[PDB]
Every structure is written in C-alpha cells, then in structure tokens.
Amino acid sequence: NKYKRIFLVVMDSVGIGEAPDAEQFGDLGSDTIGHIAEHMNGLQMPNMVKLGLGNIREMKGISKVEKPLGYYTKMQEKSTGKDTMTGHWEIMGLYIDTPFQVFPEGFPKELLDELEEKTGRKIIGNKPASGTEILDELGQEQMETGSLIVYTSADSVLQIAAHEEVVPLDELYKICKIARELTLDEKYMVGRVIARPFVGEPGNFTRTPNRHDYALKPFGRTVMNELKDSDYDVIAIGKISDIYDGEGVTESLRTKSNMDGMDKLVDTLNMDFTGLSFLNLVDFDALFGHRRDPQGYGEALQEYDARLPEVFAKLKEDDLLLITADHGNDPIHPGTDHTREYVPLLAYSPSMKEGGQELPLRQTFADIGATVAENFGVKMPEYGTSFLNEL
Ligand SMILES: O=P([O-])(O)O[C@H]1O[C@H](COP(=O)(O)O)[C@@H](O)[C@H](O)[C@H]1O
Ligand SMILES: [Mn+2]
Ligand SMILES: [Mn+2]
Ligand SMILES: [Mn+2]
User: Fold this and answer.
1) All residues at 6 or more sequence positions from 15 whose CB lies less than 8 Å from its CB, including other chains
2) Is 360 exposed, middle or buried (0-12, 13-18, 19+ CB in 10 A)?
3) What does DSSP assign to residue 239?
4) 319 in helix, strand or coil?
5) Cα–Cα distance between 275 and 1 in angstroms, integer?
6) Which residue(s) pair with 7 in the sheet?
C-alpha cells in the first residue's frame, strides 16, 4: 500500500464558489470562502495557503504559492442534492439521485396528518426553531395536552419534543420510528428524525440526554464499508459516524467543537492504525453558515488554520492528508440553506519531497472514495476516478 494511513478532513460547508449548476438551486453568486475573505478584509489562513488553497483560487488574503506543499484542485458535486448526507455519501463512493429536503416553512400537512393518524396525538409547532425557543413557547401546552411538538432546523431534520413525565420515553421513541418510516418518501425526505425529550416546569424546561437519532443508511455500500470488511481501521471523528449511520465505522470519537475535532485528529495521528481517520469539522456549517455570520465563520477558519502546523509535524512519510468540504453554506446569501458550490481539495504527504501540482478538476466527490479504495486495495466504488497515481 502507498499510504498506511489516510487522514480525511471535511471542513463542513467550506465551499469555494458557485458550481456550474448553482442556478437550479437559486445559488447564483454563492461563494463561501470568497465572501468570508471579503468580509474579513483578507482571511488569515497561512497554512492552507502553504498547502495550495490560493493555487485553487485566489481570494482576499489567500494568494497562490510557487511551491505548494501538496496537490490541489476543486471538486464538483454530481449528486442531485446539496445536503450533508448527499455530500458525504458521494465522497465515500456513492451517487445520490434523491435529495434530502429542508423545511423553512414547516412540514407539509399531508405528512403531519399521517403522523397524527398513526399515533393518535395532536401535533403543534411545525416550524424551524431552536430547542430552547420552541420549549419556551410550546412546552406548557405540550404538557397539558399530550400533543407532540414537531419542529425543524436549517438542516434536513424532523425533531419531536415531548415531556418525559407526560409522554413516556419508550412512547416518544415509538412515535419517532413511525415518523422515520413516513419520511422515507421523496415528497418529504428528512435526513434525520430526532427524539427531543425534555423535563422541568414552565419557564425552566431542559432537554435531557435521552435524545435519540433516527438516521438513514447510505444508499449503497460505501468505501468505508469495504475498508471495514477488509479489516482496516475506520476511525470516525465528530459527526462522521452519524452521517453514515455507523456504516463501515470501526471506532467513533465524539467532538464538542472544531478545536476538539482537531484534538481528536491529533489523537488519531498518535494511534498505530492502518486505514482511514475521517474528521468532520461541523462548526462552520452549524454555527456560522446557517446563522449567516461571516465574522464568526472567518474567525473559525483562522482558528482551524492555526492548528495545522502540528498536524504537518506529526504526519509520517506513509501518511496522506486530504482536506475538502461537502457543499457550500455562504454566510452572505439569502435564506438559511446550503449553497451549491465547488469544494476545495488538498492532498498532502511529507513524502511529496518536491511539493505538489494541480490535479485535474474532480468531476464527482467520489474521486476521494476511489482514491482511498485504490490505496488500500479494496473493491473500487461504482463512481469516482482515483487520483492516487497523480500524487
Ligand atoms: O445537536 P446536534 O449537534 O446533534 O444537531 C442537531 O440539532 C441541531 C439543533 O440544535 P438546537 O435546537 O439545540 O439549536 C440542528 O441544527 C441539527 O441539524 C441537528 O442535527
Ligand atoms: Mn441559495
Ligand atoms: Mn455539511
Ligand atoms: Mn447544514
């Protein structure tokens, strides 16, 4: 094998400019990194610059270098949707025709009607809201009526909140499983159903750790499945295990923040493994992209960049570092949804003694999966073209 360990980092939502098919999505003009760089009066990302980020595209404060540390290009998404699951499933070798839906105006009446019909309970709320906002507003009504608070976020989720002393936990879980079945329907395909039990009294409600998620498995066996089946390590960091519903995962490391994510990445560099360490840095998307906060996004990008030299120092000759994203989420764009953008690709190993070069544009995110598969000698995915030989 060319590399003993591959470290794959998804900077969630860190797009590098509108894709050729952005118009279809109402995403003309989108540019996640570029608009952030303009907001910041120049982004300070010297380490990503050293890798070749500016060689992909020059942006304010992000210039090309003559000798990038590794190879660089961008990737184009082939799957229909621009959600996190689609992006990640494509990265790991799939093609996803059916997009996961978001619900800025709540769920269709047809779906909620069937959920009421199957559960024998009324549904209230039906809007995007934070857990805290929706409980403050509707918690008391929920307690008094035995209704279900159904809500969403800016992502593809359906959340059901019920008080633990009013709706027994096992009943809430049964209801969520019903909702999970009803939402395997392309009219209202949600990525994730989430049980949101809460306790307390009016003016003092708190969600409990009895939260449970109901995810969909990837629509196909992924490169991760193939690595696991061939007795390789597949270490998932952060949201990765959840995104793939555990498929192909041999170890999962929970993270609480981007900095904690980098700490866990460092933890994996310190581990003797053979296979894949796969990190998702979610703060970019969750805290900054969706909240349309270019300042916070810029600061987070600078915080992430400052962590990289330690990663560079720990990489061995037979390690490969891959840095990419799963879509865009331009924090100066209308609405609250993701944006259809190219994503950067940087590929670096210390064994690249004369630095890197430009790779041909990756025509599907599955080029990553194909590269990982070829490296480890496992079954090649149906989609994707490996760039292993180019490195
Ligand atoms: O909590 P996570 O990280 O699993 O994230 C989950 O809940 C969040 C809501 O958080 P809240 O209602 O507390 O503001 C959603 O944005 C996210 O799509 C969902 O997967
Ligand atoms: Mn848009
Ligand atoms: Mn994402
Ligand atoms: Mn998102």
Assistant:
1) 30, 31, 32, 33, 325, 327, 328, 329, 330, 339, 341, 342, 343
2) exposed
3) T
4) strand
5) 10
6) 277, 321
Question: Distance (Å, rounded) from C-alpha 206 to C-alpha 215?
Answer: 24
Which tokens is 193 given? 């159903």
* Nearest ligand (C-alpha, residue 19): 2
Phi and psi, residue 7, nearest 5°:
-110, 110
Q: Which residue has the tokens 């690595």?
A: 227
Tokens, residue 376? 């480890």
Q: Which domains does the chain have, with CATH numbers?
A: 1-97+217-391 (3.40.720.10), 98-216 (3.30.70.1250)
Ligand 2 centroid to Cα of residue 328, in Å, is: 10
DSSP, collapsed to helix, strand or coil, labels residue 188 as: coil
Q: Where are the beta strands (DSSP E) in the chain?
A: 5-11, 71-75, 123-128, 148-152, 157-163, 192-201, 204-207, 212-215, 233-237, 251-253, 275-281, 319-324, 343-348
217 phi and psi angles, rounded to 5 deg: -70, 150
State which residues have CB under 5 angstroms from ligand 2, the bound ion: 26-27
Q: Tell me how far the alpha carbon of residue 286 lies from the centroid of ligand 1, in angstroms.
A: 8
How far apart CA 316 and CA 351 sit, in angstroms, is 8
Q: What kind of experiment solved this structure?
A: X-ray
In the chain, the amino acid numbered 17 is G
Report how far ligand 4's centroid is from the alpha carbon of 93 (Å): 21
